[PDB]
Amino acid sequence: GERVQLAHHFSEPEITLIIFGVMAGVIGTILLISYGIRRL
Amino acid sequence: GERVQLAHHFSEPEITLIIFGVMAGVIGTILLISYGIRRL
Amino acid sequence: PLQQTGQLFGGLVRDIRRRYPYYLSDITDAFSPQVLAAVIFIYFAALSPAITFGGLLGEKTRNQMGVSELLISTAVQGILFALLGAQPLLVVGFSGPLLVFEEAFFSFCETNGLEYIVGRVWIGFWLILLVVLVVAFEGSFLVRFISRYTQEIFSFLISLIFIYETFSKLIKIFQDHPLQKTYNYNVLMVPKPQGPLPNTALLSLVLMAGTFFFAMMLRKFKNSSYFPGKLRRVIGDFGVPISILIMVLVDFFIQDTYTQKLSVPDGFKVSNSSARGWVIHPLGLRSEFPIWMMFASALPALLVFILIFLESQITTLIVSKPERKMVKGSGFHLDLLLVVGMGGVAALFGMPWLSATTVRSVTHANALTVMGKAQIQEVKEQRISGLLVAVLVGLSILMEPILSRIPLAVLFGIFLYMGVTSLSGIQLFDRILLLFKPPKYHPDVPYVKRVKTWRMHLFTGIQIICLAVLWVVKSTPASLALPFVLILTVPLRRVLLPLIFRNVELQCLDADDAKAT
Amino acid sequence: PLQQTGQLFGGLVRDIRRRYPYYLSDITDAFSPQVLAAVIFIYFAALSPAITFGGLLGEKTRNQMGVSELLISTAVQGILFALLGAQPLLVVGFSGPLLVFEEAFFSFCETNGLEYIVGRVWIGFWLILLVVLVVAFEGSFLVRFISRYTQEIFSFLISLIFIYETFSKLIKIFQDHPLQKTYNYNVLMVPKPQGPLPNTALLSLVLMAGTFFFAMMLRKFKNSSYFPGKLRRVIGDFGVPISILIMVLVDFFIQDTYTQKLSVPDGFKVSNSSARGWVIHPLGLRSEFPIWMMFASALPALLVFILIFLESQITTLIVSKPERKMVKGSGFHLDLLLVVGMGGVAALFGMPWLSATTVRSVTHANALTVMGKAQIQEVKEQRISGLLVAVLVGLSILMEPILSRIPLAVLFGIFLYMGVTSLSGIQLFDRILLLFKPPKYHPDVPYVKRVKTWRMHLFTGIQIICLAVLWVVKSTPASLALPFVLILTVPLRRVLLPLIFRNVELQCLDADDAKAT
């Protein structure tokens, strides 16, 4: 980073990967819900 | 005129009238000569 | 392209199918002197806003985002968009609305003791989610409801704002260096002139006027019967570069007088090495980032998404008009995905998100327009010019020895040239001119020959009131509401105008392709 | 009018018969706003040369002749010529060749210990004799041998010289007030700035460019489809006055910066009350005037007569061209008699003799030209505009409170406007433009459609060599020989051009009325 940075459990790659995984989960959830709707 | 001017025998009107009279004489001379020429 | 398939990501898939087959021609169509001239012209058109907005951003954010970040973001996003976008003539860069939002968000974060750069990261994360959903459900198809009415109101307003800011910069130069009997001949120069200097304001005015004049004359020459046709067109094609070179040389050979020059950052470094590095931790840099703000970042993300979406998609509509002879197609879904997703990713590196900018993109398209024998004949549609512009913006930090010799006033003349030439194809501007012409002189166009003169003037006047309202909103603290006020013109055209105009009148006055109904 | 009757004073008598019947219309045709605009425009066109040349004359003659004498001579001779002349659109005033002759004669008189003002009196006496004889024998009929070839070479050369001097004055302003880092903020102002001043050169450049730009735009507007037709024409008619007013107000509201202003003499007094009074004694003021110089004054009289005759009669030819739609006729014999005789009389009062000046007269005629719907429709031929201009020049000494607020740079823009607009009807200038055009674009005119392109360009090039030779002669001490070098073009057209051009080619290229042979 720059200067002194507060240390987190998750590093930048780890936390960004987790956020992107949650985002992928939510996107897949909404897409599957859309697939289920419009068919019944 | 202006400042100190040489005194002449003829004043400005007199001298200019004399010059114009001589000019009229010369013009009349050349005109009469032209009238005489082109006819003989 | 604005149709709805009903298939998930269908509009995106269609965009790729439509334009990517032309990929080879998107390279070989660049082999022409007109494309190099366009590169040089749009390079300055893109560099100057980057430098100016980056300076303002650094001033207003304590250098958390500044010139270097904006330069690198512009370069990288432009390269990627040129290589992958469906409309490579769009120019991606920073804009005034984005600067206003950065101001507002920085102020909000200061009030609540938040790290502004981390909040930006979370806005970016929400931006990526929003664009994926919008593109997944083909949300870009709603652009089909933005008719020439709204397109032209937006385009005319942006052009007028561009001209107004260009003139305001010159007025500011006069304010800093007024005309006085006496000056302090010993004035500190670093970092900038600390007091009024002689000849600076007038020389800047002269340089601006001269650049504008030379550009306008060269444009007239390209059209004209002078010189062999091929020479006239190349000289005409390199009109803006030639004008820039002439006025830069004029300023160069005037050693004693000071003129403000372009200034790029020293190197490829963050603007504030004390504040942040290149990568921003989403959980916080100095303080743990609050959890509630991780969710609350969706709303600023919504506003940013709306701003970028409207600017970019209206720009795409304008540059892709049928009358402009674009025969390769554009991708509304793909371009939005690219612009917004790259912006969301850029947030992770403390870099600005961008939008396809109307004046720059229209300037770029016009510089690639080849004119018939009057009538537009074709456009050099290709990816090389935009890619090269982005690369030059990225390399600007290394070419300081060249850029430091270019006065801003020369670029002011070029900006005026862009602003005036951007008004050409706008029917609203054409109709505004008709307000000052007797009817017999109105051209043979359907909205003249099929609409009564006073009805056409009433139609123009209603549009002018919309411009007045929008300009007023721009000049207030609630200027971020501008996209919604602009959206209000779509109901105005579809709900209220038919109450006072007959159908045939509206087909004449608001025509997707300038047709006689 | 150029026919020879064979009767003494016949051409003079015919001139009176031709034009004096229109005397009533020469008054009532002035009742129009175009005529008032022309008055205002030509007032400055005539005043500025009077002031500038009078200043130079005073500097170069020790104020024996200066600004006041030239102003009064211009006013009186203009009034008389307007009331009595056969071509009242000619503007009578001082010119550069006349200034050169005054320089040379003053130098000669200084070398030989002569009173310069008295020698001028005797030159004037000889001038009156010469013109009476020339008019008596219808000598003006020789003007018929000055074809469009010579007319256009002379007109183009005079226009180019006018533009060149206008630009040289601006360059001089920059030389006096260069662009510097530092200035002496305490600089003596009286009589004139004694050192460089800030902002002066650039502000003068801006004022000149702005005046020129506004004049050229207003001229374009008068032609255009904007505004109601009658309003567009009046605004267009008052184009030069409106531009002058705008730029004068701009300079007025800039209090701190210095610009050189028009300066008229304090009152109606001789320039050097110590040197001479109002009436000059032909026999001498301080010393008796030598008799041999009374006869030797004929030769300078011959040279002065040639200068005035050629300038005035070529100007009359140009303004009276058939294509200019002058339907009242001109008097070559009467106008020469008036101009030269009034000059000879003016010498008696220590005042300049004058000539009908080409650029001023063409400007005056063009300001009175009413344009068809492109095609010249008529000319407001009348005596009032010239008479009023002469009266205003005469009254200029009393309107110092107005003239002191007019910067010379504004008039520089107007002079540039005059110089560029004077080139319009010149076929030589039109053909020079064709040298830079591909043949397909050459207009449908007889010298294009009936002459081979390269032959037409050869014809133009020979004319260009004549301009080069004349301009070179102008830039040498033997610049008073210019009328003879110009006369040499008449043998060139009549003796040598037929050796290289066929008859039909010459009828196409040198046409008295632009006819296809």
Ligand SMILES: *[C@@H]1O[C@H](CO[C@@H]2O[C@@H](C)[C@@H](O)[C@@H](O)[C@@H]2O)[C@@H](O[C@@H]2O[C@H](CO)[C@@H](O[C@@H]3O[C@H](CO)[C@@H](O[C@H]4O[C@H](CO)[C@@H](O)[C@H](O)[C@@H]4O)[C@H](O[C@H]4O[C@H](CO)[C@@H](O)[C@H](O)[C@@H]4O)[C@@H]3O)[C@H](O)[C@H]2NC(C)=O)[C@H](O)[C@H]1NC(C)=O
């Ligand atoms: C690069 O960034 C430096 C600081 O960056 C810091 O860290 C990054 C990660 C972000 O979180 C930034 O927001 C953060 O500041 C810059 O150094 C800073 O310069 C400015 C200008 O002087 C000052 O910053 C702060 O301004 C606050 C105003 O909103 C001020 O609050 C004070 O304001 C009122 C009146 O306005 C005062 O009456 C109050 O006392 C109130 O405190 C800040 O005050 C205090 O802030 C910290 C809190 O821990 C203290 O430690 C400070 O000593 C200060 O008393 C503060 O002034 C500071 O000078 C400075 N701040 C820090 C933290 O270093 C640097 O200028 C910038 N570089 C460039 C080129 O712009």
Ligand SMILES: *[C@@H]1O[C@H](CO[C@@H]2O[C@@H](C)[C@@H](O)[C@@H](O)[C@@H]2O)[C@@H](O[C@@H]2O[C@H](CO)[C@@H](O[C@@H]3O[C@H](CO)[C@@H](O[C@H]4O[C@H](CO)[C@@H](O)[C@H](O)[C@@H]4O)[C@H](O[C@H]4O[C@H](CO)[C@@H](O)[C@H](O)[C@@H]4O)[C@@H]3O)[C@H](O)[C@H]2NC(C)=O)[C@H](O)[C@H]1NC(C)=O
């Ligand atoms: C108004 O006019 C004044 C004089 O006008 C005089 O009378 C009229 C009718 C005309 O005939 C004029 O030609 C005539 O001069 C002006 O006053 C004069 O100013 C100029 C500038 O200083 C000077 O005039 C003369 O300049 C001659 C140069 O050609 C000079 O000759 C001398 O030159 C060489 C070097 O150049 C010297 O080394 C020699 O000594 C040589 O003599 C004149 O010299 C002498 O002339 C007279 C002869 O009688 C003497 O009386 C003088 O004292 C002088 O020594 C002379 O300098 C004079 O200063 C002055 N001359 C006179 C006669 O007053 C006045 O400036 C003008 N006003 C304006 C506003 O321009």
Ligand SMILES: CCCCCCCC(=O)OC[C@H](COP(=O)(O)O[C@@H]1[C@H](O)[C@H](O)[C@@H](OP(=O)(O)O)[C@H](OP(=O)(O)O)[C@H]1O)OC(=O)CCCCCCC
């Ligand atoms: C800089 C040139 C070097 C000059 C050196 C001197 C030698 C020199 O350069 O001229 C010879 C050559 C003659 O060739 P030519 O007249 O046939 O050339 C035509 C010209 O190029 C036009 O521009 C054309 O139409 P357009 O414009 O494309 O629509 C036309 O094409 P098209 O009808 O078949 O479609 C061309 O044929 O050049 C000129 O064009 C004349 C103008 C020269 C003017 C002089 C230069 C100011």
Ligand SMILES: CCCCCCCC(=O)OC[C@H](COP(=O)(O)O[C@@H]1[C@H](O)[C@H](O)[C@@H](OP(=O)(O)O)[C@H](OP(=O)(O)O)[C@H]1O)OC(=O)CCCCCCC
């Ligand atoms: C400041 C003026 C006050 C305007 C008051 C605002 C109200 C207002 O003035 O409009 C109505 C009135 C209509 O009058 P109208 O169109 O009939 O007037 C025609 C106009 O003057 C043209 O100029 C004419 O041809 P030209 O030029 O001579 O060749 C034509 O003459 P012609 O065909 O018979 O031969 C004229 O008939 O004005 C206008 O002229 C239209 C343009 C108004 C544009 C207004 C922009 C200022």
Ligand SMILES: CCCCCCCCCCCC(=O)OC[C@H](COP(=O)(O)OCC[N+](C)(C)C)OC(=O)CCCCCCCCCCC
């Ligand atoms: C394509 C070419 C463009 C044409 C448009 C030109 C616009 C130029 C703006 C000038 C006004 C200005 O900038 O005014 C602003 C300044 C200063 O104002 P203040 O009240 O002292 O400011 C108060 C705050 N201080 C104390 C910090 C300064 O005025 C002046 O010092 C007046 C000089 C104006 C010169 C006019 C230039 C020529 C204009 C006409 C050219 C045709």
Ligand SMILES: CCCCCCCCCCCC(=O)OC[C@H](COP(=O)(O)OCC[N+](C)(C)C)OC(=O)CCCCCCCCCCC
């Ligand atoms: C309709 C609009 C007209 C456009 C034409 C403009 C011509 C202006 C003349 C400038 C040159 C000049 O005047 O140069 C002359 C001067 C000084 O020369 P020096 O060597 O110091 O003189 C030596 C003798 N001293 C010591 C007595 C002075 O130069 C300069 O101080 C350089 C500054 C020039 C500014 C350029 C103005 C903008 C030009 C481009 C506008 C499009």
Ligand SMILES: CC(C)CCC[C@@H](C)[C@H]1CC[C@H]2[C@@H]3CC=C4C[C@@H](O)CC[C@]4(C)[C@H]3CC[C@]12C
């Ligand atoms: C649309 C974007 C913002 C993704 C979805 C937002 C929400 C649902 C997700 C994204 C990633 C998540 C965070 C990921 C990591 C952790 C660390 C854990 O010790 C506390 C919760 C916390 C801080 C999560 C809270 C909820 C969170 C912010």
Ligand SMILES: CC(C)CCC[C@@H](C)[C@H]1CC[C@H]2[C@@H]3CC=C4C[C@@H](O)CC[C@]4(C)[C@H]3CC[C@]12C
């Ligand atoms: C063409 C003009 C100059 C007129 C003709 C010039 C000759 C012929 C004439 C005109 C007037 C004449 C002068 C008039 C007055 C006198 C005064 C006298 O005591 C001596 C001769 C003298 C000085 C004359 C000499 C000749 C003269 C100069």
Ligand SMILES: CC(C)CCC[C@@H](C)[C@H]1CC[C@H]2[C@@H]3CC=C4C[C@@H](O)CC[C@]4(C)[C@H]3CC[C@]12C
């Ligand atoms: C408002 C400003 C900017 C422009 C001023 C001029 C406008 C309003 C003028 C110019 C020409 C005018 C028209 C001329 C003639 C007629 C015919 C009449 O039966 C109905 C009105 C109508 C159609 C006029 C309406 C007003 C009009 C359109």
Ligand SMILES: CC(C)CCC[C@@H](C)[C@H]1CC[C@H]2[C@@H]3CC=C4C[C@@H](O)CC[C@]4(C)[C@H]3CC[C@]12C
């Ligand atoms: C000299 C500079 C200023 C102008 C350069 C262009 C001139 C010289 C060019 C332009 C067009 C040219 C002409 C084009 C074609 C031909 C046909 C040929 O069978 C004879 C020569 C002729 C008629 C050329 C002569 C030279 C020409 C007139």
